[PDB]
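Q: A reviewer asked whether we had any structural model of the full assembly, not just the individual parts. We don't, so I'm hoping you can provide one. Inputs are below.
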Amino acid sequence: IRGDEVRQIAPGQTGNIADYNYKLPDDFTGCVIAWNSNKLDSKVSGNYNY
Amino acid sequence: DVVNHNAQALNTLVKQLSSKFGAISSVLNDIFSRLDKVEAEVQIDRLIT
Amino acid sequence: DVVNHNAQALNTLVKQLSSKFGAISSVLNDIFSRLDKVEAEVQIDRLIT
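A: Here is a predicted structure for the entire assembly that you could use as a starting point for your response.
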């Protein structure tokens, strides 16, 4: 996920990620982990694999 | 008074539908629409209590 | 009825242990094992009340 949308992975939220891509259930019982991946995904030309 | 204790005690009860009881609103749909579900289930729980 | 009214009042008082009262569970050990103290104290407060 682009970092400006990392808060969109949450139950009961509305967004382009939160509606058109995927939705979390309101009764979701689990955990969410995020990590920086600039040294593994960010390229000078640009990563078109996502 | 047998009439007057029965007309009053309903009118006290019915007007108790207008109270907030510490919640943000006495209207159910305002809590359902203006809040997240986990917080709406707390405010509506306060209203129900 | 004197036999019945003291039998329906107790059994109901048993069945109201199955109520959640807005908490995440009606079993206190599940709340104390799944959540830390500050989070679980609100749920235990709701159940106790």
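A: Points you may want to mention in the reply: Residues 16-21 of chain A form the longest helix (6 residues). Chain A is about 20% helix and 0% strand.
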